[PDB]
PDB file of C-alpha atoms and ligand atoms in Angstrom:
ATOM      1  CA  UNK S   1       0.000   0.000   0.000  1.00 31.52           C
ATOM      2  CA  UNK S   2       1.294   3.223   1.171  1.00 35.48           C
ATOM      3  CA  UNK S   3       5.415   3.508   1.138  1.00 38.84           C
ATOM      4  CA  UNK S   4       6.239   0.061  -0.450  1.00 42.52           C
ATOM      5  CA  UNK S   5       9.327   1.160  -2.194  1.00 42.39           C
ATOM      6  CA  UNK S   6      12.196  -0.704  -0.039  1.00 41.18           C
ATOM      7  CA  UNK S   7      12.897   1.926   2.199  1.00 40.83           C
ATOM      8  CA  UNK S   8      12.830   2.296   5.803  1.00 39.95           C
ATOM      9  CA  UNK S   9      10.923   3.908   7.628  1.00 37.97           C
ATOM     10  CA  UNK S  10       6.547   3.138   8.515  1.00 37.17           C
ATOM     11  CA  UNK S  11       3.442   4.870   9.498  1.00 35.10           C
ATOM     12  CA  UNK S  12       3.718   5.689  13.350  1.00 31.98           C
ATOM     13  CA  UNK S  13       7.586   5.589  13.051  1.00 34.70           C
ATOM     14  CA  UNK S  14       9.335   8.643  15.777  1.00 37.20           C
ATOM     15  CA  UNK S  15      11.805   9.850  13.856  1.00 38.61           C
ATOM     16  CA  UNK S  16      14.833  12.481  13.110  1.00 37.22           C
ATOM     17  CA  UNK S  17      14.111  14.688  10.208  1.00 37.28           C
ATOM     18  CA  UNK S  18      16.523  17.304   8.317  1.00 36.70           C
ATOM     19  CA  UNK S  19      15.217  20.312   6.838  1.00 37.71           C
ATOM     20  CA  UNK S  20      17.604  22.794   4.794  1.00 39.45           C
ATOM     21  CA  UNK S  21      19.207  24.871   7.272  1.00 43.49           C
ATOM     22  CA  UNK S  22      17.549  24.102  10.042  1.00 43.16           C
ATOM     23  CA  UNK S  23      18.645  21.526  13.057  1.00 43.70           C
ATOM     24  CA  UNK S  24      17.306  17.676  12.903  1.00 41.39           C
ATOM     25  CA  UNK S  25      13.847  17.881  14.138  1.00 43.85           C
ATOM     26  CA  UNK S  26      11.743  15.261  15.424  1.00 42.52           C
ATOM     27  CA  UNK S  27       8.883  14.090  14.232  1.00 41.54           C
ATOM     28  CA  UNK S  28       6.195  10.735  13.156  1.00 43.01           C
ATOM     29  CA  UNK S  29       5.765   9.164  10.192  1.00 42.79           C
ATOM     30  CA  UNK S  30       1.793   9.790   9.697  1.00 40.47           C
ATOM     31  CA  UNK S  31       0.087   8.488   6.169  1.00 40.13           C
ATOM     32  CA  UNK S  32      -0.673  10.714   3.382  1.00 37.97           C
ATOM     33  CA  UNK S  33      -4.604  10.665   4.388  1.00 39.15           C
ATOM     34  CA  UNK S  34      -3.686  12.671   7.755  1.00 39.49           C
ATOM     35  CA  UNK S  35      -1.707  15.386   5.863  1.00 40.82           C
ATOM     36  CA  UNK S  36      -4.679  16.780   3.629  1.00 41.84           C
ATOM     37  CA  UNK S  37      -2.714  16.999   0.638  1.00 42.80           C
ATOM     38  CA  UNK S  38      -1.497  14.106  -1.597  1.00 37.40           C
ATOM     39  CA  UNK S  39       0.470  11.456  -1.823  1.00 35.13           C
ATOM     40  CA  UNK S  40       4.014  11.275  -0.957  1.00 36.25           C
ATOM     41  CA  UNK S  41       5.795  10.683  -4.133  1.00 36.11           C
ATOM     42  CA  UNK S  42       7.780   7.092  -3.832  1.00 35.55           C
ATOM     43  CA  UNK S  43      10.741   7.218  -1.747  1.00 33.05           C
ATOM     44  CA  UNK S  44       9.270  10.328   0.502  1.00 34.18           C
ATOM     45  CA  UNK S  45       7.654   9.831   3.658  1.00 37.25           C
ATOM     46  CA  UNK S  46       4.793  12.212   4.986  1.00 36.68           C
ATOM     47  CA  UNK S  47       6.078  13.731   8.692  1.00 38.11           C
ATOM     48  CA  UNK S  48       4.610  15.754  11.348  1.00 39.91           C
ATOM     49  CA  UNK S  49       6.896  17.749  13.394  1.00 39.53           C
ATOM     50  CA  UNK S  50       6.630  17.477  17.279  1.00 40.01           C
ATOM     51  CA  UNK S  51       6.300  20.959  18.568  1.00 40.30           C
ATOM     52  CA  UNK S  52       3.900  22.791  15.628  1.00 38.98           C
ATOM     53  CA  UNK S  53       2.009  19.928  14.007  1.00 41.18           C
ATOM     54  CA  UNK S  54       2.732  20.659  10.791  1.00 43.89           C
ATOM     55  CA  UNK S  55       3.470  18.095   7.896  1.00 41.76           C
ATOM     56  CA  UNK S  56       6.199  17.514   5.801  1.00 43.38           C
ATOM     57  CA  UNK S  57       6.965  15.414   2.430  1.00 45.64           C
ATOM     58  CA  UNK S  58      10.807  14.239   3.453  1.00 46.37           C
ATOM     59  CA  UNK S  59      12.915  11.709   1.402  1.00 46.19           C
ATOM     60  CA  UNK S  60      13.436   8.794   3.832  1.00 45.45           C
ATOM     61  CA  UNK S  61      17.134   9.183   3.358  1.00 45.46           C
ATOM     62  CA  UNK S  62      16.837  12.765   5.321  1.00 43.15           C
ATOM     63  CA  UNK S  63      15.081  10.963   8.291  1.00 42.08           C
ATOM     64  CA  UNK S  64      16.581   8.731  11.090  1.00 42.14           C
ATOM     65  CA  UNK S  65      14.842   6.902  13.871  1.00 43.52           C
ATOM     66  CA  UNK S  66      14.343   8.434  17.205  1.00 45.17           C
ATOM     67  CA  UNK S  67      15.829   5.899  19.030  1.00 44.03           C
ATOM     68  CA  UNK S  68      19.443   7.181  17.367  1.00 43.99           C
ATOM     69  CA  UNK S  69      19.155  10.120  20.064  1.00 42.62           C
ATOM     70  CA  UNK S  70      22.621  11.300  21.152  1.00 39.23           C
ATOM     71  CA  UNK S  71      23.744  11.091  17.578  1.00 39.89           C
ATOM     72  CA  UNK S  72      21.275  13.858  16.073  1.00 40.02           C
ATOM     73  CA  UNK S  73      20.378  15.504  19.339  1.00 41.47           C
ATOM     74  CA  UNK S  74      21.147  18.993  18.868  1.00 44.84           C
ATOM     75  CA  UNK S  75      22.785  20.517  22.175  1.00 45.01           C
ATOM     76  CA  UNK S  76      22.868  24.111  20.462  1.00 46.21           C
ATOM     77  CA  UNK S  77      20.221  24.607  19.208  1.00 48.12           C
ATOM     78  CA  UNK S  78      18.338  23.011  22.647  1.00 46.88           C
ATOM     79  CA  UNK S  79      19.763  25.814  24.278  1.00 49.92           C
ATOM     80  CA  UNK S  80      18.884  28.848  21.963  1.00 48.51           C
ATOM     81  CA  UNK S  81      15.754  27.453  20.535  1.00 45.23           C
ATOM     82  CA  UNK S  82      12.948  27.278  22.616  1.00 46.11           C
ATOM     83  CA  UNK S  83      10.686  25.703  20.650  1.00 43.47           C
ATOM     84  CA  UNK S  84      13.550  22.731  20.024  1.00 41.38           C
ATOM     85  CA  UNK S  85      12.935  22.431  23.590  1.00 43.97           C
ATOM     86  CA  UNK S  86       9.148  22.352  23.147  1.00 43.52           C
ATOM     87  CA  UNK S  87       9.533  19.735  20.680  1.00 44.90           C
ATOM     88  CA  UNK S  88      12.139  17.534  22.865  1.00 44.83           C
ATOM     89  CA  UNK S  89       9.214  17.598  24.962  1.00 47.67           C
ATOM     90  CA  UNK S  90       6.275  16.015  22.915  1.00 46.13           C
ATOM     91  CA  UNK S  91       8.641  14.030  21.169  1.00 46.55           C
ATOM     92  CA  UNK S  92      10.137  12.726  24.074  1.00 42.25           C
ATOM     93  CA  UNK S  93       6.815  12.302  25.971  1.00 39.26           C
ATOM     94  CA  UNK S  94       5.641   9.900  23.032  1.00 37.87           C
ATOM     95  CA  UNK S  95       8.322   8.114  23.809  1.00 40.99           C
ATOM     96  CA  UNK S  96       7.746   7.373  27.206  1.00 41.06           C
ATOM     97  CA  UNK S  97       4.082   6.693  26.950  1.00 42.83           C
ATOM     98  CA  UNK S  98       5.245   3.824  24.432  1.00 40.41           C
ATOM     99  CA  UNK S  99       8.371   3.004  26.179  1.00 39.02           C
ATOM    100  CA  UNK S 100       5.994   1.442  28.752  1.00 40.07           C
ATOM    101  CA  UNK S 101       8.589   4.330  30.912  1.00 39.17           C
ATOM    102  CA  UNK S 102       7.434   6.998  34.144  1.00 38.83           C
ATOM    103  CA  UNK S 103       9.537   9.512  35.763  1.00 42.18           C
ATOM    104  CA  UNK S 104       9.419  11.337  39.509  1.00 42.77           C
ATOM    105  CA  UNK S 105       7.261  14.430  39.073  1.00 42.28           C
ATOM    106  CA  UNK S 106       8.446  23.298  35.439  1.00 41.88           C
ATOM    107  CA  UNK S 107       9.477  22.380  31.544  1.00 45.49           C
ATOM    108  CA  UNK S 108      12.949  22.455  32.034  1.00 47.81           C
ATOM    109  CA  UNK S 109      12.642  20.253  35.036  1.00 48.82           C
ATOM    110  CA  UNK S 110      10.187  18.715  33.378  1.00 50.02           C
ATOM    111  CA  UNK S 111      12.667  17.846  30.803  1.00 50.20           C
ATOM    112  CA  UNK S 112      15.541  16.870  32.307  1.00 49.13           C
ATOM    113  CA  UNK S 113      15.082  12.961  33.391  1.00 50.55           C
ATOM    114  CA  UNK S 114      13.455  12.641  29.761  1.00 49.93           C
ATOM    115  CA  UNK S 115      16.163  14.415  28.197  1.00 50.14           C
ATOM    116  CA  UNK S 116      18.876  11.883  30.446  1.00 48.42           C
ATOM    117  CA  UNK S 117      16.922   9.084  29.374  1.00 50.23           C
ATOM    118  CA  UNK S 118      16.545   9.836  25.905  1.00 51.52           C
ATOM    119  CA  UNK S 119      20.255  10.258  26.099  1.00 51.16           C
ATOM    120  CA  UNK S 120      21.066   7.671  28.247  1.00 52.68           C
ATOM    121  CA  UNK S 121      19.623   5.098  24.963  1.00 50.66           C
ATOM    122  CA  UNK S 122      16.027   4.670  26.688  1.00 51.44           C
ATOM    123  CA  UNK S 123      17.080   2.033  29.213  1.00 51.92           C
ATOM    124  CA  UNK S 124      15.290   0.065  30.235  1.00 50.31           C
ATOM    125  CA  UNK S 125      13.714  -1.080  26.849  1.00 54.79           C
ATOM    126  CA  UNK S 126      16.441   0.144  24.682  1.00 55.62           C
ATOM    127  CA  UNK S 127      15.267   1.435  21.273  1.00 60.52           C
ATOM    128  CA  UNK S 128      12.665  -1.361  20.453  1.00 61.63           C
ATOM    129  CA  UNK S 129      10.819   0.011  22.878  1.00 66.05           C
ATOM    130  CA  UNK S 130       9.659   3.198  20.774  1.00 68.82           C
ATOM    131  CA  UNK S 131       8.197   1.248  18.160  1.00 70.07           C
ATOM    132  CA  UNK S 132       4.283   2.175  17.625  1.00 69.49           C
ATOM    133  CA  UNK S 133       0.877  -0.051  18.439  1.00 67.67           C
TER     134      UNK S 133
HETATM  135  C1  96H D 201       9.237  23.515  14.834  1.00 67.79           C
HETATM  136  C2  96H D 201       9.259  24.504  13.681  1.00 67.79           C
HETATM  137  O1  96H D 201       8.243  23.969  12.817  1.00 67.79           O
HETATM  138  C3  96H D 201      10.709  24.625  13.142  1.00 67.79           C
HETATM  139  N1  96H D 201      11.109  24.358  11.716  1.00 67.79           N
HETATM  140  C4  96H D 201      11.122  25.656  10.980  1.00 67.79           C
HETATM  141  C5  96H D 201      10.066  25.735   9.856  1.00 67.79           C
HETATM  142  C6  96H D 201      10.587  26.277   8.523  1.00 67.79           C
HETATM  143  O2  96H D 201       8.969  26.550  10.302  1.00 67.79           O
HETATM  144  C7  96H D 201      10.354  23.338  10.923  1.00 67.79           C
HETATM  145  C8  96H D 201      10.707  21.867  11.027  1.00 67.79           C
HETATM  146  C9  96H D 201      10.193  21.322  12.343  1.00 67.79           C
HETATM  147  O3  96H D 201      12.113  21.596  10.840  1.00 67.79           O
END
């Protein structure tokens, strides 16, 4: 059906995406029906970004899974940014909700032990544990 061409990369999917000149974002895979428009031509993937909402058509060779965190996390551009930081938030929050994963009970405080986590490689479950359903 919908993004049968080989590449990685499926519907529900949290994921790095790279957009000209700006830091890698996160974001999910969503289908094309969610986006309004059309069709992602073959070898794109339709993406909302955490943070705004907004979709995207991205080849899947400018995305990387979520789970990669330390590698595309963005230290920068988390402190300048605040909406990076917004978006570390959401993102990360999926994460946890699937990861099966609580933390102890402000943003940045909010942040942190997600942030350590997402850093630390999202022990206990490891990666495998941000897959969707
Ligand atoms: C979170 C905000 O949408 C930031 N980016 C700039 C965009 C051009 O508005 C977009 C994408 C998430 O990389």
């Amino acid at each position: 059906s919908e993004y049968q061409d080989g590449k990685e990369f499926g519907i529900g999917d949290l994921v790095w995406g790279k957009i000209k000149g700006f830091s890698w974002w996160p974001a999910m895979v969503v289908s094309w029906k969610a986006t309004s428009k059309r069709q992602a031509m073959s070898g794109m993937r339709w993406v909302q970004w955490f943070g705004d909402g907004k979709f995207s058509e991205v080849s899947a060779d400018k995305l990387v899974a979520l789970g990669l965190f330390s590698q595309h996390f963005n230290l920068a551009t988390f402190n300048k940014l605040v909406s990076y930081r917004k978006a570390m938030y959401h993102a990360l929050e999926k994460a946890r909700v699937r990861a099966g994963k609580t933390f102890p009970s402000s943003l940045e405080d909010q942040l942190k032990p997600m942030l350590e986590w997402a850093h630390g490689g999202f022990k206990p479950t490891g990666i495998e544990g941000l897959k969707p359903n």
